[PDB]
C-alpha cells in the first residue's frame, strides 16, 4: 500500500516495545527465542527460550519484547535466519514500557495488567479486563499512560 | 481529484520504449520493441478522491 498515512492529524505517540530511560529501566538480552516474536508484547520464558504467549499453564512472563528503532522495517517482529535476523531478543522487564493492548481494552491508570495468553495474533496483548478470553494476570504490573492507538505504557513494579 | 505534487504521485516508467535493430532473414524484416514501466506509483492512500455517478 502507498503508505500507512498521507497526513497524520497529530504525531503518533510512542509505539509499543519502548522503555523510557528516565525511570529505573532494565531490558535484558535473551540469546535464544522464538521465530516471529512479535515485539511490543508480553513474551514468556519457556524451556529456556523467549517465546510468544500461548495456552500454557503458568507462563513465566519475562517482560515486554523491546522495539528496535534500527531494526528491519516491517511488522514489529523478532525473526531469525534471514537478512533481517535478530541475534538477541531484547526484553523489557523492569520499568515503564509501552505494550500493545487489545482493541476492546479501555484500561485506566493503575489497573492490573492482564495479558492475552492465547495462541493467535492477539497473543501477549495487555488488557484491563480480568475476564477477557485467555486473560492471564501479570504479577505486579499496572497500566500507566495512554500512548498511540492500542498502545499503553505500563509499569512493572518488580522485575518481570 | 489528485495532487500533482512530486511527493504525492509519480509516474514510474524506468525504461522508455526501445526498438531493436532491424533483423533481415533474407526477405523477412522483423523489429521488436519493449518498455519497462511501474505505472502510477501512488505514494499516499489519501492523495486523491473519487466521485462515482457524475
Amino acid at each position: 500500500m502507498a503508505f500507512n498515512n498521507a497526513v497524520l492529524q497529530e504525531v503518533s505517540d510512542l509505539p509499543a516495545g519502548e522503555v523510557i530511560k528516565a525511570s529505573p529501566h532494565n531490558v535484558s538480552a535473551f540469546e535464544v527465542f522464538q521465530n516471529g516474536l512479535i515485539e511490543g508484547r508480553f513474551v514468556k520464558f519457556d524451556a529456556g527460550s523467549i517465546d510468544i504467549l500461548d495456552a500454557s499453564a503458568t507462563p513465566t512472563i519475562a517482560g515486554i519484547a523491546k522495539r528496535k528503532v534500527t531494526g528491519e522495517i516491517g511488522p514489529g517482529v523478532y525473526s531469525t535466519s534471514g537478512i533481517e535476523i535478530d541475534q538477541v531478543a531484547e526484553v523489557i522487564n523492569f520499568g515503564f514500557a509501552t505494550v500493545t493492548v487489545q482493541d476492546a481494552a479501555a484500561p485506566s491508570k493503575y489497573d492490573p495488567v492482564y495479558a492475552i495468553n492465547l495462541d493467535s495474533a492477539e497473543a501477549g496483548k495487555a488488557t484491563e479486563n480480568s475476564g477477557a478470553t485467555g486473560a492471564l494476570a501479570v504479577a505486579d504490573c499496572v497500566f500507566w499512560e495512554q500512548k498511540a492507538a492500542n498502545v499503553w505504557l505500563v509499569r512493572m513494579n518488580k522485575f518481570l | 481529484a489528485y495532487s500533482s505534487n512530486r511527493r504525492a504521485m509519480q509516474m514510474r516508467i524506468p525504461t522508455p520504449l526501445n526498438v531493436s535493430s532491424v533483423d533481415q532473414r533474407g526477405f523477412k524484416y522483423y523489429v521488436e520493441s519493449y518498455f519497462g514501466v511501474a505505472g502510477l506509483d501512488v505514494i499516499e492512500d489519501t492523495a486523491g478522491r473519487h466521485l462515482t455517478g457524475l
Binding site: 503508505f3 498521507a6 497526513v7 497524520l8 497529530e10 | 511527493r7 524506468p14 505514494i43
Partner: peptide, 24 residues
C-alpha cells in the same frame, strides 16, 4: 539453480526524501 542476480539488486531504492506530513 534459480538465477544469478541476488534479490537486493533487482529491487531499487529511491533516493528521494519522503518527509512525514502533519496537520498545519
Amino acid at each position: 539453480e534459480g538465477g544469478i542476480i541476488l534479490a537486493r539488486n533487482l529491487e531499487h531504492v529511491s533516493s528521494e526524501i519522503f518527509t512525514q506530513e502533519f496537520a498545519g
